[PDB]
Each structure stands twice: as C-alpha cells, then as structure tokens.
Symmetry: D2
Subunit: 31 residues, 4 copies
C-alpha cells in the first residue's frame, strides 16, 4: 500500500482518469 | 442512459478496464 | 490472447473507457 | 493543455491507470 503520482499532459484525458479514480475512491468511502 | 459493449482484444488489459468498471458499478451498489 | 466484451451502463462513462481503448488500439496501429 | 497530478493510494490500481496513460503517451510518440 503506497502512494504514487500520475502526472498526465492535457486536460480532458486527466478528467477521464479522475472519474475512474473517483469510483475507486468511492469504494473506500462505502460506509 | 443506454447500454454499450466494449470488445477489447487481449486478456490482461480487459481486466484493467474491468476494475475501473468494478468501482463504478460499486457506486450504483452504494446501499 | 482472447476477445472479451465490456457492457457498461450509461453513455459518458462508456466514452471514457473508449478513449483508453482508443490509444491501446493505436498501439496496435503503430505502423 | 495543462499538466495535472493524479495521486492514487495502493499499488496495483496505480499500475492500471499507468497502462491507460502508457498507450495515450504512445499516441504522442506515434512517429
């Protein structure tokens, strides 16, 4: 369990990955 | 709100997308 | 190497995964 | 066109996003 940084270039593509990470984070917030 | 099919070639890559869809689906199952 | 189907519900989210698959497919088209 | 950082927790999940970003980056390297 470690923390990694994902620096991507652009703006819209970064939002796509942000959505996939938004649901995963929701898993940790499944209370 | 419609249903779309994503047919990908390979096997491991398909699992990656499956994980991103596993959390999104978890959002719908946030009960 | 097999073919799998990824049926997702919604419309915008499907586009996100479509982009990640658009680049991967571009890898196979790296000629 | 800007640069954003995606800090995710874990280790395997970060690899998944790294793959989707590996192909996108390959698009910029389509020479």
């Amino acid at each position: 369990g470690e923390y990694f940084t994902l620096q991507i270039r652009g703006r819209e593509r970064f939002e796509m990955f942000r959505e996939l990470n938004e649901a995963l984070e929701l898993k940790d917030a499944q209370a």
